[PDB]
Copies of this chain bind each other. A is one copy, B any other.
Amino acid sequence: FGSGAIGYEFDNRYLNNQEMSAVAKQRLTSLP
C-alpha cells in the first residue's frame, strides 16, 4: 500500500545524524 510520513521522518533523521557526524570531524587547526 502506501503512507510515507514515518519513512520520511526516519530517513530525514538518519541523514541528520550522518550530517551531524560529518560536522564533528571539522577542525580549524592551530599550528602555524
Contacts and interface: CB of A to CB of B under 8 A. Distances in A.
A13 B13 contact: no
Interface string A16-32: 11111111111101111
A13 to B, nearest CB: 5
Interface residues of A, number: 25
Count of this chain's copies in the oligomeric assembly: 12
Interface of A: 4, 6, 8, 10-27, 29-32
27 contacts: A4-B6, A6-B8, A10-B12, A10-B15, A13-B15, A13-B19, A14-B15, A14-B18, A15-B17, A16-B19, A17-B18, A17-B19, A17-B22, A19-B20, A20-B22, A20-B23, A21-B22, A21-B25, A22-B24, A23-B24, A24-B25, A24-B26, A24-B27, A25-B25, A27-B29, A30-B31, A30-B32
